[PDB]
DNA sequence: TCGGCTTCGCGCA
DNA sequence: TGCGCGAAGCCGAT
C-alpha cells in the first residue's frame with residue numbers, strides 16, 4: 034500500500050474489507066513514540082494515499098491495577114510528552130479508558146474510521162483484544178511490527194530452540210530490514226484529560242505502594258526520566274560513555290555500565306532499530322558492539338519469538354522436555370529453605386546477595402542484568418515447587434520492574450527457571466539439571482560486598 | 490553422527 | 503582477573 038522507503042513485510046492484514054472514507058486510526062499500544070515508529074509511518078502513508086488525516090488512539094485499561102505507580106507514572110508522563118509532540122505535527126491523540134475490545138470498536142463507528150492500524154505485541158492479552166475488535170469493525174485492520182528490527186513473523190515461522198539457531202536467521206535479514214527511518218510527515222487535514230487519569234490512577238494504587246518501616250516509599254523516581262526525549266539522551270550517553278567498556282563490565286552490577294534503555298524500550302519510547310542504527314555506526318570496541326548487539330537484536334527479538342509461538346510462555350508447559358522431566362523428578366527433594374511470596378518480596382532471606390538484588394528492584398525499579406539470573410534461580414531453589422517458583426518470579430518481576438510485563442521478562446524467567454533457550458548442566462538436588470548459580474561464583478566475578486552495601 | 494551451545498562452577502596462573 | 507575444562511541434552515548441518 035504505497036510508500037518508497039516502505040517495506041511491506043513490516044505490515045500484515047488482520048481483517049479485509051472496504052476502506053471507508055474516514056480518517057486512518059492508529060491504535061497505539063506498545064510503541065509509545067512519535068519518531069522511528071513504523072506503525073505511525075504506515076498510518077501516515079495510508080492516510081496520504083486516501084487524502085485523509087491520521088489520528089492516534091491510546092486505550093488505558095485496568096491492567097495498571099496489577100502493577101505499581103512506578104510503571105503508571107513512567108508511562109503517563111511519557112504520554113503527556115507524546116501528546117505535545119504529535120500535536121506539533123497536527124496529529125490529534127484520543128485517550129480512551131476501558132476494554133479495548135469495546136472502546137476501539139465504538140470509536141471506529143463513532144469517528145467513521147476508514148482504516149485501522151495497530152502495532153504488534155506477542156502477549157496473550159493483545160491477541161484477545163484484536164479478535165474482539167475484528168468482530169466489531171467492518172473496515173480494514175492492519176498490524177505493524179514497530180518493535181523489532183525484523184518482523185517477528187518474518188524472522189522465524191516456528192519456536193526457536195536456542196540463539197545459535199535463531200542467530201543466522203536474524204543477521205541474514207539485517208541488510209534488508211535495517212534502514213533509516215523516514216521523517217513523520219505532519220497532517221494536512223486537522224479533524225480524556227491525561228492529568229485527570231494520572232490523578233485517579235495514583236489514588237487507586239496508593240494503598241498498594243511499597244513502603245518502608247517509617248511508611249516512606251521505597252521507589253526512587255529520579256533514576257530514569259520518562260519520555261521520548263529523555264530516552265534519546267540515555268542512548269547518546271551509552272554510546273559516548275558506556276558502549277566502549279560494555280563488553281568487559283556488563284556482568285559487574287557494581288558498575289553502571291549498562292545501557293539503561295529497557296524501561297524506554299518496553300514502553301516503546303525509543304525504537305530498538307534506532308539504537309542499532311546508532312550502535313552500528315559508532316566506532317567503539319568491536320567486542321563490546323558484538324556483545325551489545327547480541328542482546329538488543331538476538332535475545333530481545335527471540336523473546337518475541339518465544340512468546341509469539343508459545344501461548345503458554347508463562348507456564349511450566351513451555352519448558353523444554355528435558356527440563357520438565359528433570360524438575361518433575363526433583364519435586365520431592367527437600368529444600369534447604371522455603372520462602373513465601375511475602376518473604377521473597379520483602380527481601381527477608383538468608384542470602385544477603387539475594388536480598389540486595391531485591392532491594393535494588395524495589396528502590397530503583399531496574400535490577401541489574403546479571404543479578405536477575407541469580408535472583409530468579411535462587412527463587413527456584415527456595416520454593417515449594419517449580420510452579421510456585423515460576424509464579425513468584427513472574428509476580429515480582431511484573432510488579433516492580435519498570436521493564437516488566439514484557440516478552441523479555443517471560444523469556445528471561447523461563448531461561449532461569451525452565452532452561453528455555455538454554456541447555457542441561459550438572460545434576461543437582463532440587464534444581465535438577467537446570468543451570469546453577471552460587472554466591473561463591475558471584476564473589477569471583479564482581480565485588481559482592483560492594484553490591485550488598487549499596488542496597489543495605 | 491558429530492559440533493557447539495549467553496550470560497554456569499572450578500582449579501590455576 | 504583471565505583461561506581452559508567439566509557436565510550435560512539437543513538442534514541442525516549433512
Ligand SMILES: Cc1cc2nc3c(=O)[nH]c(=O)nc-3n(C[C@H](O)[C@H](O)[C@H](O)COP(=O)(O)OP(=O)(O)OC[C@H]3O[C@@H](n4cnc5c(N)ncnc54)[C@H](O)[C@@H]3O)c2cc1C
Pocket residue numbers: 283291292293294295298299328329330332333334336400401402403405406409430434436437438439441442443444445446448449
Ligand atoms: C529473570 C530475568 C528477568 C528479566 N526481566 C526482564 C523484563 O521484565 N523486561 C525486560 O525488558 N528484560 C528483562 N530481563 C532481560 C534483561 O536482563 C534486561 O533486558 C536488562 O537487564 C535490562 O537492562 P539494560 O537494558 O540496561 O541491559 P543491556 O545490557 O543494556 O541490554 C540492552 C537491551 O537488550 C535487551 N536484552 C538484554 N539482555 C536481554 C536478555 N537476557 N533477554 C532479552 N533481551 C535482553 C533489552 O531490550 C535491553 O534493553 C530479564 C532477564 C532475566 C534473566
